[PDB]
Amino acid sequence: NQIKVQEKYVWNKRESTEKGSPLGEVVEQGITRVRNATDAVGIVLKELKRQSSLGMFHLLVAVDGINALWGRTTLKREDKSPIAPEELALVHNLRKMMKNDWHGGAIVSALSQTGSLFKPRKAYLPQELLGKEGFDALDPFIPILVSNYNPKEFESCIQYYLENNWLQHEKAPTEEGKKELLFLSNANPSLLERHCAYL
RNA sequence: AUGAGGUGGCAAGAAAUGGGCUACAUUUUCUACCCCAGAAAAUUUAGC
Ligand SMILES: Nc1nc2c(ncn2[C@@H]2O[C@H](COP(=O)(O)OP(=O)(O)O)[C@@H](O)[C@H]2O)c(=O)[nH]1
């Protein structure tokens, strides 16, 4: 309700959003009529990127699995032809937000090979997952490395699971069980969580 | 002529039994990957 549009958006000949209306209306038009949902998303982005520059609010763009934008799609036409990511309006409008042509906010993203298309299981580095086009788009950027648990973090996570009584095996609270879990997971948070799930 | 040729004709149906070929899925199927993802929907024959 505080954020308001600066243009007249025409959903159809009968319905339009007038200048100065709250942004929520636009969202509502996307939530009520799905036909205009995709058009409603882009407008929101178009507004949020612009108004944040004016200084009305601070904007955070949190995109998880950002590598999808500059890759390949598994969506097909009716002629069984491949569709490129840029041919999707939802993907096309979200690329404009990743460009550093606006101020008043920060862009944070996380890579992900899980659910990625046409990538090997062991690819995790920025260029390998992003592609040349993705690296060129994001460049310049600050990469931040996320690693496996160090011994302090591993011990604290196991203590958290024990405090929640989530390790029911009698040998789990002992020290030998902790060494075995450490070796089996290699301090990987996801493998440790999955192993502790059924113990 | 138990050799070589010409002409036409010869098309088959019933059960009772034996075998063979196909698909038969949720512990499944399609895509990415090659395993931390997303969507769809009783008799009897052998073997160890
Ligand atoms: N239904 C509707 N959608 C709009 C309208 N204006 C912008 N949009 C959508 O909001 C997005 C804003 O992105 P934009 O700045 O216009 O980039 P452009 O598509 O290349 O012109 C567009 O991609 C449209 O999908 C409008 O007047 N009516």
Ligand SMILES: [Mg+2]
């Ligand atoms: Mg005959």
